[PDB]
Amino acid sequence: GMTEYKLVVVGAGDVGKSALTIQLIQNHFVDEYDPTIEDSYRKQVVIDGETCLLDILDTAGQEEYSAMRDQYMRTGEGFLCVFAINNTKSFEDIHHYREQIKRVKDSEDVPMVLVGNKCDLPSRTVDTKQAQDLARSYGIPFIETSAKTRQGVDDAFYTLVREIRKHKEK
Ligand SMILES: Nc1nc2c(ncn2[C@@H]2O[C@H](COP(=O)(O)OP(=O)(O)NP(=O)(O)O)[C@@H](O)[C@H]2O)c(=O)[nH]1
Ligand SMILES: [Mg+2]
Ligand SMILES: [Mg+2]
Ligand SMILES: [Mg+2]
Ligand SMILES: [Mg+2]
């Protein structure tokens, strides 16, 4: 009888989709190869005093899996749209992910958070102002994260749940 939220993590290869999810679930970062390409996780959390169960779908982002993207997305209630701040192509891809989500959910109003990951790095190619303005143009929150240091990780997922809760009031 507990409220469940279905989250889907999307973004280009190597942006840190899995690392962010593993930090949320296991509270660690380990840079090691893992051959799985489709993983569902369940985590019970308390957000604003309300307990819920997150079902988090984390799939590999390489283009060779692109035919499955819409089918994974179609299961989601909310989307963590991740790019890496040192990967300009991953930021350019965000527009196409947003368009695909809108198409799959048949709506211009879909719970979504833009995540700029790898903020621990000493260099970056994507300016924070550019990402903030993009998020504003979509009407979604923007959060900078590091799966390595854990900065912003809880805030990214919890903000997404808050976005779903607000959407369900409509
Ligand atoms: N410095 C730093 N490295 C990170 C961060 N997040 C992930 N990485 C590293 O970047 C690489 C890709 O991370 P991974 O979580 O596998 O990314 P993914 O988005 O799930 N890739 P795929 O689409 O192939 O499943 C790994 O070497 C990982 O350790 C971060 O916040 N900071
Ligand atoms: Mg990979
Ligand atoms: Mg992954
Ligand atoms: Mg640093
Ligand atoms: Mg909005």
Author numbering: 0 to 169
Give the article text:
The electron density associated with GMPPNP, magnesium, and switch regions was unambiguous in the high-resolution maps. In the GMPPNP-bound KRASG13D structure, Switch I is in State 1, since it moves away from the GMPPNP, and T35 does not contact the Mg2+ ion. The refinement protocol fixed the major conformer to the State 1 conformation (represented by the GMPPNP-bound KRASG13D crystal structure), as indicated by the 31P spectra. The pairwise RMSDs between these and the ground state (i.e., the starting crystal structure) are between 1.0 and 1.3 Å (with no significant displacements of the switch regions ). In the GMPPNP-bound KRASG13D, a consistent deviation between the ground state and the excited state can be observed in the allosteric lobe, which has not been previously reported due to the lower resolution of the solved structures. In the RDC restrained model, the slight departures of β5 and β6 strands of the excited state relative to the ground state result in a displaced α4 helix away from the ground state (crystal structure) position.
RAS proteins are the central node in signaling pathways controlling cell proliferation, survival, and differentiation through interactions with various effectors, such as RAF, PI3K, and others. KRAS, one of the three RAS isoforms (KRAS, HRAS, NRAS), is the most frequently mutated RAS protein in cancer patients, and G12, G13, and Q61 are three hot spots among the oncogenic mutations.
